[PDB]
Each structure stands twice: as C-alpha cells, then as structure tokens.
mmCIF file of C-alpha atoms in Angstrom:
data_model
loop_
_atom_site.group_PDB
_atom_site.id
_atom_site.type_symbol
_atom_site.label_atom_id
_atom_site.label_comp_id
_atom_site.label_asym_id
_atom_site.label_seq_id
_atom_site.Cartn_x
_atom_site.Cartn_y
_atom_site.Cartn_z
ATOM 1 C CA UNK X 1 37.278 19.112 53.473
ATOM 2 C CA UNK X 2 34.345 20.304 51.362
ATOM 3 C CA UNK X 3 35.523 23.915 51.115
ATOM 4 C CA UNK X 4 38.425 22.719 48.953
ATOM 5 C CA UNK X 5 36.036 22.034 46.070
ATOM 6 C CA UNK X 6 32.573 23.441 46.835
ATOM 7 C CA UNK X 7 31.193 26.606 45.252
ATOM 8 C CA UNK X 8 27.919 28.454 45.813
ATOM 9 C CA UNK X 9 27.793 29.120 42.080
ATOM 10 C CA UNK X 10 28.947 27.478 38.853
ATOM 11 C CA UNK X 11 32.741 27.022 39.054
ATOM 12 C CA UNK X 12 34.801 28.666 36.304
ATOM 13 C CA UNK X 13 36.576 25.332 35.785
ATOM 14 C CA UNK X 14 34.096 22.592 36.685
ATOM 15 C CA UNK X 15 36.424 19.779 35.604
ATOM 16 C CA UNK X 16 39.111 20.932 38.039
ATOM 17 C CA UNK X 17 36.520 21.223 40.816
ATOM 18 C CA UNK X 18 35.333 17.706 40.001
ATOM 19 C CA UNK X 19 38.868 16.320 40.176
ATOM 20 C CA UNK X 20 39.494 17.877 43.603
ATOM 21 C CA UNK X 21 36.041 16.773 44.780
ATOM 22 C CA UNK X 22 36.871 13.176 43.894
ATOM 23 C CA UNK X 23 40.222 13.270 45.649
ATOM 24 C CA UNK X 24 38.763 14.820 48.794
ATOM 25 C CA UNK X 25 35.706 12.563 49.035
ATOM 26 C CA UNK X 26 37.518 9.348 48.131
ATOM 27 C CA UNK X 27 39.870 10.142 51.006
ATOM 28 C CA UNK X 28 36.980 10.746 53.402
ATOM 29 C CA UNK X 29 35.262 7.526 52.312
ATOM 30 C CA UNK X 30 38.449 5.479 52.556
ATOM 31 C CA UNK X 31 37.096 2.404 50.784
ATOM 32 C CA UNK X 32 34.313 3.687 48.554
ATOM 33 C CA UNK X 33 34.086 0.370 46.686
ATOM 34 C CA UNK X 34 33.185 -1.553 49.854
ATOM 35 C CA UNK X 35 30.714 1.155 50.889
ATOM 36 C CA UNK X 36 29.188 1.094 47.398
ATOM 37 C CA UNK X 37 28.884 -2.703 47.450
ATOM 38 C CA UNK X 38 26.999 -2.597 50.753
ATOM 39 C CA UNK X 39 24.758 0.208 49.502
ATOM 40 C CA UNK X 40 24.115 -1.795 46.338
ATOM 41 C CA UNK X 41 23.059 -4.789 48.429
ATOM 42 C CA UNK X 42 20.661 -2.616 50.437
ATOM 43 C CA UNK X 43 19.146 -1.077 47.321
ATOM 44 C CA UNK X 44 18.955 -4.569 45.822
ATOM 45 C CA UNK X 45 16.600 -5.638 48.627
ATOM 46 C CA UNK X 46 14.221 -2.925 47.449
ATOM 47 C CA UNK X 47 14.587 -3.931 43.794
ATOM 48 C CA UNK X 48 13.724 -7.466 44.901
ATOM 49 C CA UNK X 49 10.583 -6.210 46.664
ATOM 50 C CA UNK X 50 9.597 -4.307 43.526
ATOM 51 C CA UNK X 51 10.110 -7.323 41.266
ATOM 52 C CA UNK X 52 8.116 -9.486 43.673
ATOM 53 C CA UNK X 53 5.255 -6.983 43.553
ATOM 54 C CA UNK X 54 5.344 -6.854 39.751
ATOM 55 C CA UNK X 55 5.336 -10.660 39.610
ATOM 56 C CA UNK X 56 2.194 -10.742 41.765
ATOM 57 C CA UNK X 57 0.598 -8.072 39.604
ATOM 58 C CA UNK X 58 0.392 -6.039 42.801
ATOM 59 C CA UNK X 59 0.765 -2.276 42.780
ATOM 60 C CA UNK X 60 4.269 -0.894 43.300
ATOM 61 C CA UNK X 61 3.370 2.801 43.409
ATOM 62 C CA UNK X 62 1.592 3.414 46.721
ATOM 63 C CA UNK X 63 -2.077 4.140 45.977
ATOM 64 C CA UNK X 64 -4.110 6.351 48.317
ATOM 65 C CA UNK X 65 -7.636 7.671 47.930
ATOM 66 C CA UNK X 66 -8.070 11.422 48.123
ATOM 67 C CA UNK X 67 -11.151 10.642 50.211
ATOM 68 C CA UNK X 68 -8.822 9.395 52.948
ATOM 69 C CA UNK X 69 -6.524 12.412 52.643
ATOM 70 C CA UNK X 70 -9.527 14.749 52.915
ATOM 71 C CA UNK X 71 -10.929 12.848 55.904
ATOM 72 C CA UNK X 72 -7.529 12.587 57.553
ATOM 73 C CA UNK X 73 -7.796 8.804 57.512
ATOM 74 C CA UNK X 74 -4.537 7.821 55.805
ATOM 75 C CA UNK X 75 -3.030 5.011 57.895
ATOM 76 C CA UNK X 76 0.472 4.972 59.347
ATOM 77 C CA UNK X 77 1.150 1.960 57.115
ATOM 78 C CA UNK X 78 0.150 3.975 54.056
ATOM 79 C CA UNK X 79 2.412 6.857 55.060
ATOM 80 C CA UNK X 80 5.226 4.344 55.613
ATOM 81 C CA UNK X 81 4.732 2.943 52.110
ATOM 82 C CA UNK X 82 5.171 6.365 50.534
ATOM 83 C CA UNK X 83 8.361 6.978 52.509
ATOM 84 C CA UNK X 84 9.655 3.584 51.392
ATOM 85 C CA UNK X 85 8.799 4.037 47.692
ATOM 86 C CA UNK X 86 9.267 7.800 47.371
ATOM 87 C CA UNK X 87 6.120 8.219 45.282
ATOM 88 C CA UNK X 88 2.345 8.036 45.373
ATOM 89 C CA UNK X 89 -0.826 7.961 43.317
ATOM 90 C CA UNK X 90 -3.729 9.964 44.758
ATOM 91 C CA UNK X 91 -6.929 8.440 43.391
ATOM 92 C CA UNK X 92 -9.758 10.831 42.630
ATOM 93 C CA UNK X 93 -7.852 13.896 43.800
ATOM 94 C CA UNK X 94 -10.458 15.722 41.706
ATOM 95 C CA UNK X 95 -13.690 14.273 40.289
ATOM 96 C CA UNK X 96 -13.140 12.867 36.802
ATOM 97 C CA UNK X 97 -15.665 15.296 35.315
ATOM 98 C CA UNK X 98 -13.939 18.220 37.026
ATOM 99 C CA UNK X 99 -10.580 17.245 35.507
ATOM 100 C CA UNK X 100 -12.043 16.717 32.039
ATOM 101 C CA UNK X 101 -13.895 19.997 32.468
ATOM 102 C CA UNK X 102 -10.654 21.819 33.232
ATOM 103 C CA UNK X 103 -9.065 20.427 30.069
ATOM 104 C CA UNK X 104 -11.992 21.669 27.963
ATOM 105 C CA UNK X 105 -12.007 24.990 29.822
ATOM 106 C CA UNK X 106 -8.369 25.617 28.879
ATOM 107 C CA UNK X 107 -9.094 24.749 25.251
ATOM 108 C CA UNK X 108 -11.981 27.241 25.167
ATOM 109 C CA UNK X 109 -9.696 29.860 26.740
ATOM 110 C CA UNK X 110 -7.177 29.252 23.945
ATOM 111 C CA UNK X 111 -9.864 29.548 21.246
ATOM 112 C CA UNK X 112 -11.326 32.686 22.776
ATOM 113 C CA UNK X 113 -7.922 34.312 22.426
ATOM 114 C CA UNK X 114 -7.208 32.923 18.955
ATOM 115 C CA UNK X 115 -4.127 31.000 20.076
ATOM 116 C CA UNK X 116 -3.716 29.314 16.683
ATOM 117 C CA UNK X 117 -3.512 32.744 15.051
ATOM 118 C CA UNK X 118 -1.053 34.282 17.515
ATOM 119 C CA UNK X 119 1.169 31.305 18.353
ATOM 120 C CA UNK X 120 3.685 14.405 18.321
ATOM 121 C CA UNK X 121 3.441 15.750 21.907
ATOM 122 C CA UNK X 122 3.101 19.467 22.632
ATOM 123 C CA UNK X 123 3.594 21.727 25.646
ATOM 124 C CA UNK X 124 1.399 24.826 25.810
ATOM 125 C CA UNK X 125 3.084 28.113 26.833
ATOM 126 C CA UNK X 126 -0.017 28.997 28.859
ATOM 127 C CA UNK X 127 0.069 29.549 32.622
ATOM 128 C CA UNK X 128 -2.881 31.621 33.772
ATOM 129 C CA UNK X 129 -6.076 29.913 32.630
ATOM 130 C CA UNK X 130 -8.783 29.878 35.283
ATOM 131 C CA UNK X 131 -8.638 26.072 35.224
ATOM 132 C CA UNK X 132 -4.905 26.010 35.987
ATOM 133 C CA UNK X 133 -4.983 28.550 38.791
ATOM 134 C CA UNK X 134 -8.189 27.310 40.416
ATOM 135 C CA UNK X 135 -6.655 23.827 40.527
ATOM 136 C CA UNK X 136 -3.503 25.259 42.111
ATOM 137 C CA UNK X 137 -5.353 27.178 44.850
ATOM 138 C CA UNK X 138 -8.021 24.518 45.414
ATOM 139 C CA UNK X 139 -8.697 23.046 48.843
ATOM 140 C CA UNK X 140 -7.984 19.616 47.367
ATOM 141 C CA UNK X 141 -4.500 20.569 46.179
ATOM 142 C CA UNK X 142 -3.741 22.305 49.470
ATOM 143 C CA UNK X 143 -4.743 19.188 51.415
ATOM 144 C CA UNK X 144 -2.580 16.935 49.257
ATOM 145 C CA UNK X 145 0.448 19.232 49.462
ATOM 146 C CA UNK X 146 0.160 19.459 53.255
ATOM 147 C CA UNK X 147 -0.098 15.687 53.555
ATOM 148 C CA UNK X 148 2.898 15.087 51.299
ATOM 149 C CA UNK X 149 5.089 17.766 52.884
ATOM 150 C CA UNK X 150 4.404 16.323 56.326
ATOM 151 C CA UNK X 151 6.017 13.018 55.339
ATOM 152 C CA UNK X 152 9.284 14.952 55.606
ATOM 153 C CA UNK X 153 11.153 15.695 58.817
ATOM 154 C CA UNK X 154 11.008 19.476 58.404
ATOM 155 C CA UNK X 155 11.755 20.268 62.044
ATOM 156 C CA UNK X 156 15.175 19.288 63.369
ATOM 157 C CA UNK X 157 17.473 20.673 66.068
ATOM 158 C CA UNK X 158 15.051 23.364 67.178
ATOM 159 C CA UNK X 159 14.675 24.692 63.639
ATOM 160 C CA UNK X 160 11.819 24.505 61.149
ATOM 161 C CA UNK X 161 13.187 24.361 57.614
ATOM 162 C CA UNK X 162 9.887 24.918 55.834
ATOM 163 C CA UNK X 163 6.160 25.356 56.427
ATOM 164 C CA UNK X 164 4.539 22.115 55.231
ATOM 165 C CA UNK X 165 1.056 23.611 55.316
ATOM 166 C CA UNK X 166 1.619 26.319 52.701
ATOM 167 C CA UNK X 167 3.127 25.639 49.281
ATOM 168 C CA UNK X 168 4.082 28.354 46.814
ATOM 169 C CA UNK X 169 2.275 28.750 43.509
ATOM 170 C CA UNK X 170 4.620 27.299 40.921
ATOM 171 C CA UNK X 171 3.015 28.102 37.544
ATOM 172 C CA UNK X 172 3.819 25.452 34.983
ATOM 173 C CA UNK X 173 2.704 24.486 31.506
ATOM 174 C CA UNK X 174 0.082 21.956 30.502
ATOM 175 C CA UNK X 175 1.006 19.033 28.256
ATOM 176 C CA UNK X 176 -1.469 17.461 25.857
ATOM 177 C CA UNK X 177 -0.853 14.306 23.836
ATOM 178 C CA UNK X 178 -3.691 13.224 21.540
ATOM 179 C CA UNK X 179 -4.254 9.654 20.328
ATOM 180 C CA UNK X 180 -1.774 8.815 17.587
ATOM 181 C CA UNK X 181 1.071 10.654 19.301
ATOM 182 C CA UNK X 182 4.531 9.203 18.703
ATOM 183 C CA UNK X 183 7.348 10.170 21.052
ATOM 184 C CA UNK X 184 10.850 8.914 21.808
ATOM 185 C CA UNK X 185 10.118 9.572 25.469
ATOM 186 C CA UNK X 186 12.532 10.969 28.054
ATOM 187 C CA UNK X 187 15.566 9.205 29.476
ATOM 188 C CA UNK X 188 15.805 8.460 33.197
ATOM 189 C CA UNK X 189 17.039 11.435 35.200
ATOM 190 C CA UNK X 190 16.560 13.506 38.329
ATOM 191 C CA UNK X 191 15.966 17.231 38.704
ATOM 192 C CA UNK X 192 16.678 19.782 41.436
ATOM 193 C CA UNK X 193 20.277 20.070 40.297
ATOM 194 C CA UNK X 194 22.943 17.898 38.704
ATOM 195 C CA UNK X 195 26.542 19.023 39.218
ATOM 196 C CA UNK X 196 25.183 20.991 42.184
ATOM 197 C CA UNK X 197 24.572 17.756 44.070
ATOM 198 C CA UNK X 198 28.340 17.308 44.439
ATOM 199 C CA UNK X 199 29.682 20.879 44.406
ATOM 200 C CA UNK X 200 27.071 22.962 46.237
ATOM 201 C CA UNK X 201 27.907 23.500 49.931
ATOM 202 C CA UNK X 202 24.216 22.991 50.714
ATOM 203 C CA UNK X 203 24.103 19.581 49.051
ATOM 204 C CA UNK X 204 27.336 18.493 50.723
ATOM 205 C CA UNK X 205 25.464 19.069 53.979
ATOM 206 C CA UNK X 206 22.296 17.337 52.758
ATOM 207 C CA UNK X 207 24.307 14.327 51.619
ATOM 208 C CA UNK X 208 26.898 14.466 54.393
ATOM 209 C CA UNK X 209 26.127 10.909 55.526
ATOM 210 C CA UNK X 210 26.419 9.639 51.965
ATOM 211 C CA UNK X 211 29.816 11.206 51.312
ATOM 212 C CA UNK X 212 31.245 10.180 54.676
ATOM 213 C CA UNK X 213 30.170 6.555 54.312
ATOM 214 C CA UNK X 214 27.614 6.598 57.138
ATOM 215 C CA UNK X 215 24.822 5.518 54.771
ATOM 216 C CA UNK X 216 22.739 4.016 57.582
ATOM 217 C CA UNK X 217 22.301 7.583 58.823
ATOM 218 C CA UNK X 218 21.277 9.099 55.497
ATOM 219 C CA UNK X 219 17.558 9.891 55.405
ATOM 220 C CA UNK X 220 16.093 11.111 52.092
ATOM 221 C CA UNK X 221 13.216 12.613 54.055
ATOM 222 C CA UNK X 222 15.399 14.928 56.154
ATOM 223 C CA UNK X 223 14.699 18.507 55.029
ATOM 224 C CA UNK X 224 17.687 20.259 56.618
ATOM 225 C CA UNK X 225 19.626 22.438 54.159
ATOM 226 C CA UNK X 226 17.653 21.439 51.059
ATOM 227 C CA UNK X 227 15.953 24.832 51.306
ATOM 228 C CA UNK X 228 19.378 26.472 50.905
ATOM 229 C CA UNK X 229 20.062 24.865 47.529
ATOM 230 C CA UNK X 230 20.278 27.268 44.591
ATOM 231 C CA UNK X 231 20.477 25.691 41.143
ATOM 232 C CA UNK X 232 23.269 27.044 38.932
ATOM 233 C CA UNK X 233 22.580 29.635 36.241
ATOM 234 C CA UNK X 234 23.987 28.239 32.984
ATOM 235 C CA UNK X 235 23.557 30.158 29.710
ATOM 236 C CA UNK X 236 16.368 25.837 35.713
ATOM 237 C CA UNK X 237 14.089 25.703 38.757
ATOM 238 C CA UNK X 238 13.989 28.562 41.266
ATOM 239 C CA UNK X 239 11.993 26.726 43.919
ATOM 240 C CA UNK X 240 12.604 23.948 46.386
ATOM 241 C CA UNK X 241 10.199 21.104 45.669
ATOM 242 C CA UNK X 242 9.667 18.282 48.153
ATOM 243 C CA UNK X 243 7.667 16.415 45.516
ATOM 244 C CA UNK X 244 7.290 16.831 41.781
ATOM 245 C CA UNK X 245 3.845 15.957 40.517
ATOM 246 C CA UNK X 246 1.066 16.291 38.020
ATOM 247 C CA UNK X 247 -2.665 15.907 37.820
ATOM 248 C CA UNK X 248 -4.195 13.800 35.070
ATOM 249 C CA UNK X 249 -6.509 15.755 32.769
ATOM 250 C CA UNK X 250 -7.250 12.594 30.787
ATOM 251 C CA UNK X 251 -7.325 8.890 31.584
ATOM 252 C CA UNK X 252 -3.832 7.434 31.120
ATOM 253 C CA UNK X 253 -3.582 3.924 29.649
ATOM 254 C CA UNK X 254 -0.871 1.328 30.428
ATOM 255 C CA UNK X 255 2.044 1.240 27.987
ATOM 256 C CA UNK X 256 1.109 4.476 26.223
ATOM 257 C CA UNK X 257 4.356 6.379 26.818
ATOM 258 C CA UNK X 258 3.903 6.830 30.549
ATOM 259 C CA UNK X 259 5.860 8.228 33.452
ATOM 260 C CA UNK X 260 8.147 5.711 35.186
ATOM 261 C CA UNK X 261 10.096 6.182 38.418
ATOM 262 C CA UNK X 262 12.663 4.226 40.409
ATOM 263 C CA UNK X 263 10.513 3.899 43.588
ATOM 264 C CA UNK X 264 13.530 3.969 45.905
ATOM 265 C CA UNK X 265 14.159 7.506 47.213
ATOM 266 C CA UNK X 266 17.545 6.500 48.622
ATOM 267 C CA UNK X 267 18.680 5.519 45.113
ATOM 268 C CA UNK X 268 20.281 8.972 44.871
ATOM 269 C CA UNK X 269 22.993 7.743 47.258
ATOM 270 C CA UNK X 270 24.052 5.210 44.610
ATOM 271 C CA UNK X 271 24.045 7.965 41.984
ATOM 272 C CA UNK X 272 26.222 10.220 44.145
ATOM 273 C CA UNK X 273 28.858 7.588 44.878
ATOM 274 C CA UNK X 274 28.996 6.030 41.395
ATOM 275 C CA UNK X 275 31.418 8.627 39.920
ATOM 276 C CA UNK X 276 33.828 7.922 42.771
ATOM 277 C CA UNK X 277 34.522 4.330 41.746
ATOM 278 C CA UNK X 278 37.726 3.212 39.984
ATOM 279 C CA UNK X 279 36.323 2.935 36.439
ATOM 280 C CA UNK X 280 35.422 6.601 36.000
ATOM 281 C CA UNK X 281 37.486 9.117 33.973
ATOM 282 C CA UNK X 282 39.003 11.929 36.064
ATOM 283 C CA UNK X 283 36.940 14.760 34.562
ATOM 284 C CA UNK X 284 33.647 12.864 34.230
ATOM 285 C CA UNK X 285 30.580 12.484 36.427
ATOM 286 C CA UNK X 286 28.834 9.589 34.677
ATOM 287 C CA UNK X 287 27.046 11.741 32.108
ATOM 288 C CA UNK X 288 26.491 14.846 34.221
ATOM 289 C CA UNK X 289 27.137 18.126 32.436
ATOM 290 C CA UNK X 290 26.412 21.760 33.295
ATOM 291 C CA UNK X 291 23.110 22.914 31.820
ATOM 292 C CA UNK X 292 21.600 19.427 31.682
ATOM 293 C CA UNK X 293 19.527 17.213 33.960
ATOM 294 C CA UNK X 294 21.344 14.459 35.844
ATOM 295 C CA UNK X 295 21.128 11.336 33.665
ATOM 296 C CA UNK X 296 20.671 7.792 34.957
ATOM 297 C CA UNK X 297 21.681 5.027 32.553
ATOM 298 C CA UNK X 298 22.285 1.307 32.254
ATOM 299 C CA UNK X 299 25.919 2.136 31.502
ATOM 300 C CA UNK X 300 26.483 3.693 34.921
ATOM 301 C CA UNK X 301 23.502 2.674 37.052
ATOM 302 C CA UNK X 302 22.379 -0.800 35.939
ATOM 303 C CA UNK X 303 20.944 -1.651 39.369
ATOM 304 C CA UNK X 304 18.736 1.434 39.324
ATOM 305 C CA UNK X 305 17.476 1.188 35.750
ATOM 306 C CA UNK X 306 16.168 -2.313 36.496
ATOM 307 C CA UNK X 307 13.790 -0.759 39.029
ATOM 308 C CA UNK X 308 12.065 1.704 36.677
ATOM 309 C CA UNK X 309 8.331 1.302 37.244
ATOM 310 C CA UNK X 310 5.438 2.689 35.217
ATOM 311 C CA UNK X 311 2.549 4.505 36.852
ATOM 312 C CA UNK X 312 -0.543 2.270 36.886
ATOM 313 C CA UNK X 313 -3.626 3.060 34.794
ATOM 314 C CA UNK X 314 -5.007 6.466 35.774
ATOM 315 C CA UNK X 315 -8.367 8.181 35.441
ATOM 316 C CA UNK X 316 -8.581 11.914 34.816
ATOM 317 C CA UNK X 317 -8.602 13.537 38.229
ATOM 318 C CA UNK X 318 -5.927 11.269 39.715
ATOM 319 C CA UNK X 319 -2.566 12.816 40.574
ATOM 320 C CA UNK X 320 0.897 11.264 40.810
ATOM 321 C CA UNK X 321 3.795 12.383 42.962
ATOM 322 C CA UNK X 322 7.470 11.644 43.481
ATOM 323 C CA UNK X 323 10.190 12.713 45.914
ATOM 324 C CA UNK X 324 12.575 15.388 44.565
ATOM 325 C CA UNK X 325 15.473 12.903 44.421
ATOM 326 C CA UNK X 326 13.508 10.210 42.615
ATOM 327 C CA UNK X 327 14.721 9.070 39.208
ATOM 328 C CA UNK X 328 12.030 9.291 36.549
ATOM 329 C CA UNK X 329 11.525 8.799 32.832
ATOM 330 C CA UNK X 330 8.817 8.728 30.181
ATOM 331 C CA UNK X 331 8.665 5.605 28.044
ATOM 332 C CA UNK X 332 8.540 5.937 24.260
ATOM 333 C CA UNK X 333 5.294 5.338 22.401
ATOM 334 C CA UNK X 334 4.226 4.945 18.780
ATOM 335 C CA UNK X 335 0.641 5.717 17.740
ATOM 336 C CA UNK X 336 -0.434 6.343 21.333
ATOM 337 C CA UNK X 337 -3.842 5.007 22.351
ATOM 338 C CA UNK X 338 -6.043 7.360 24.335
ATOM 339 C CA UNK X 339 -4.946 10.791 25.545
ATOM 340 C CA UNK X 340 -1.998 11.843 27.683
ATOM 341 C CA UNK X 341 -2.908 15.215 29.167
ATOM 342 C CA UNK X 342 -1.361 16.393 32.419
ATOM 343 C CA UNK X 343 -1.161 19.522 34.554
ATOM 344 C CA UNK X 344 2.168 19.964 36.367
ATOM 345 C CA UNK X 345 1.670 21.051 39.995
ATOM 346 C CA UNK X 346 4.396 20.259 42.554
ATOM 347 C CA UNK X 347 4.644 20.504 46.324
ATOM 348 C CA UNK X 348 6.995 23.369 47.222
ATOM 349 C CA UNK X 349 6.680 24.309 50.928
ATOM 350 C CA UNK X 350 7.134 27.919 51.966
ATOM 351 C CA UNK X 351 10.621 28.928 53.037
ATOM 352 C CA UNK X 352 12.873 31.913 52.352
ATOM 353 C CA UNK X 353 13.801 30.607 48.905
ATOM 354 C CA UNK X 354 10.248 29.879 47.803
ATOM 355 C CA UNK X 355 8.915 33.166 49.162
ATOM 356 C CA UNK X 356 11.431 34.970 46.960
ATOM 357 C CA UNK X 357 10.046 33.194 43.903
ATOM 358 C CA UNK X 358 6.471 33.716 45.103
ATOM 359 C CA UNK X 359 6.955 37.481 44.826
ATOM 360 C CA UNK X 360 8.146 37.048 41.245
ATOM 361 C CA UNK X 361 5.220 34.736 40.497
ATOM 362 C CA UNK X 362 2.761 37.322 41.789
ATOM 363 C CA UNK X 363 4.243 39.947 39.476
ATOM 364 C CA UNK X 364 4.053 37.624 36.463
ATOM 365 C CA UNK X 365 0.463 36.744 37.336
ATOM 366 C CA UNK X 366 -0.490 40.432 37.484
ATOM 367 C CA UNK X 367 0.851 40.944 33.961
ATOM 368 C CA UNK X 368 -0.088 37.558 32.530
ATOM 369 C CA UNK X 369 3.554 37.088 31.559
ATOM 370 C CA UNK X 370 5.482 33.827 31.359
ATOM 371 C CA UNK X 371 6.928 32.793 34.767
ATOM 372 C CA UNK X 372 10.646 33.299 35.417
ATOM 373 C CA UNK X 373 11.772 29.682 34.976
ATOM 374 C CA UNK X 374 10.135 29.493 31.553
ATOM 375 C CA UNK X 375 10.822 31.026 28.113
ATOM 376 C CA UNK X 376 9.702 34.635 27.693
ATOM 377 C CA UNK X 377 6.682 34.166 25.427
ATOM 378 C CA UNK X 378 4.085 36.179 27.395
ATOM 379 C CA UNK X 379 1.180 35.047 25.206
ATOM 380 C CA UNK X 380 -1.504 35.783 27.816
ATOM 381 C CA UNK X 381 -0.581 39.394 28.594
ATOM 382 C CA UNK X 382 -3.480 40.666 26.457
ATOM 383 C CA UNK X 383 -5.787 37.651 26.785
ATOM 384 C CA UNK X 384 -9.306 37.795 28.180
ATOM 385 C CA UNK X 385 -10.729 35.284 30.644
ATOM 386 C CA UNK X 386 -7.350 35.110 32.368
ATOM 387 C CA UNK X 387 -7.122 34.347 36.104
ATOM 388 C CA UNK X 388 -6.106 37.583 37.871
ATOM 389 C CA UNK X 389 -5.160 38.734 41.364
ATOM 390 C CA UNK X 390 -8.859 39.428 41.920
ATOM 391 C CA UNK X 391 -9.550 35.693 41.528
ATOM 392 C CA UNK X 392 -7.190 34.636 44.324
ATOM 393 C CA UNK X 393 -8.708 32.954 47.369
ATOM 394 C CA UNK X 394 -7.057 32.924 50.797
ATOM 395 C CA UNK X 395 -4.946 29.851 49.972
ATOM 396 C CA UNK X 396 -3.717 31.431 46.753
ATOM 397 C CA UNK X 397 -2.742 34.634 48.533
ATOM 398 C CA UNK X 398 -0.696 32.765 51.131
ATOM 399 C CA UNK X 399 0.851 30.727 48.318
ATOM 400 C CA UNK X 400 2.015 34.019 46.788
ATOM 401 C CA UNK X 401 3.429 35.418 50.018
ATOM 402 C CA UNK X 402 0.739 38.101 50.077
ATOM 403 C CA UNK X 403 -0.584 39.798 53.219
#
C-alpha cells in the first residue's frame, strides 16, 4: 500500500508520488472527510480548553520549576500536562545571573577575536564559545533533557528506540535581538521534515494510525520509527529531536515578537490528513514544497491557527521546549522593547542516527568549524578562548559518542 508511493530519498517526480500517495491513502481511509470531521471535533476540545485558560488569564504552556526537575519532584499531573500540551517552560533552568553572564561571555569572546573585523534581528555564526558548550554539557541541561525524553514511550515491543538519558551535542547558533528590533516574524510551521512526513517509509510507520483512520490509536509520544527518519537532501537537520528548545539569555517580554506554539501535539494528524480532502489540487500538499519547512496557515488549517499561543513572560535562565511535531511561529514586532536573546539547545536522545551526527560534531568541534547542518563559515577555526575537546566533561563526551 505504502510501497506504491514511498521513497527513502527525494523522489525524482514528487508531484507524481504525491498523486499516487493521495489515491492510495484515500482508499485506505475510505471516508477521509468523516474521519477528519471527528478529528477536528477532538482537536476542538483542546482549542476550547486553551481559550478557557486564556480567558482566565491562566497559563497555557505548562510551567515547571527546574528545582523540581533537579529534585525529582515533578508530579504525575505535571508530566501529564506536558504530554497534553506538547510543550513546557522550565523556570530558572539556570540562575538569571548565570544566563546573563553567558551572554556577556559570548560577546567578550567575539570581541577578543575581532568578529566585527573578520565577519533588525541577527543570528551569530558562532558555535564553540565556552558559554555555549558549557551550557550544553551542564548537569542542568542533562537533567532537563532526561526528564523531557522520558515523557516519550521509547521502549515498545521489546525494543528500545533511543537512550533518553544521553542526548547528542547539537551545536546551534545564538540569536540576539536588541531593543528597537523590528521583524516580520516567522510563519507557523513544523520542522523535522515536510514532504517526508507523507512519503518517507519511516513516517508512514510513525503515522500509520493516522493514515489508516484509527486516530484513537495514534500517540504523538510513541518513539517507534522516528529514529529511522532521514530528512531529504535538497539543493536540513541531521538529528532526531524529541523536543526543540532554547534557553533565554535575556528576559523576554510579552508581545515583543515572541515564540508561539499550537499546544496540541496531536495537531499534526490534522495537518497530515488535510491535503487528502476534496478541495485540494492533485499536485499540491497545502503549501508544502521540497526544500522548505511545512507551513501551517489559516487558508488550510484554520482550526489550528486559532490555537497559536505565545510563551509567557520569561526571565533569563528560563528555557522553553516543544514536541518535534508541534507547530510554532514567531510573532512580528516593531521597535521591540527589551532584549530577545536565546540559545538553541534541543533534546536529541542517542540512537544510531544521532551517534552518526555526534561523530561529525566531534570533528567540527576539534577544528572549530561550522557544524554540518549549518553554512560553511568556519569563523572560529583560528579563534582563541574557544571550547575544545580538552574542556569536555563526562556528559559532553557521552554526548559526542566518545569512549
């Protein structure tokens, strides 16, 4: 059924593959419209909960204290909330002064190496500052990643899909937005693949209960086969992330062009079935295109867009997280008040796929070169004060697949 249209790599004729995919899946579903209507009603109950919370001024994003994570005192109710909303805010993951200190440390590292001489939001092509790497291999980050990964069912049918207690080092850039920044923001979308979610054999397995109409049996927290997903290479993320996330390096004020998410992890089911309805052109996938993130819009997903929810006010040191299937955006802002500085650090549990990238990460770290999933700029190759292999602690070594 799936073999008639699936492909482990980018199909030579994606439109033809899409057409066959639609024919095959519509046949399997039988009455996709009825299934979609029921799914819409179920998702609507969640949207209602979200609107009720907003009306009460109550928090929508689950909020947990790092203190509880560290002490191992997060309640079952709290864990349940994260599984229901697909996201979380970890308060005081790092002391506020530590987070602010890291931001200043990176700036001093840039000055020391005359960045301005060798090089309105802006992403820095820097990956190996001591602040960035120490944060990544910190006990605090390790504890949070373990906690988050364990919300997933990673063991099923006598097989462990990933090690929740060790996450690979996924070097990313730091973003800094000073007061006065004006940005159009980013439209709602999801990562971890677009067209792949329909054509990759691995995703057909992951979403088997979505595409066969047995939605009641689809669990967004089931890990099976997600570790086998390989994003297409078009003209790009090489790791499996359970959660995307970032740590605040500055306080983040309400309404100042902030991250928003649709706190309904199962919303992806609606996204996957939408292109199968009767008002979609044969060759189209509601905006999806090779080489671009999967877009979510009012045009195609009105029910989902209504649920977009901003992160609450944050203090530097807090971290925010969202399930890999969660729809997210960044609201526009004009003459931003306060700062908007963040450090991207996800949760990517060790597995065959992530170990392969870990080896590449280790090599880049040794040279100070830009990581594989990023542009080849290699600014830090001759920089001083850089974090090196000699600075790795035991957690960092495991996170790099080292002995």
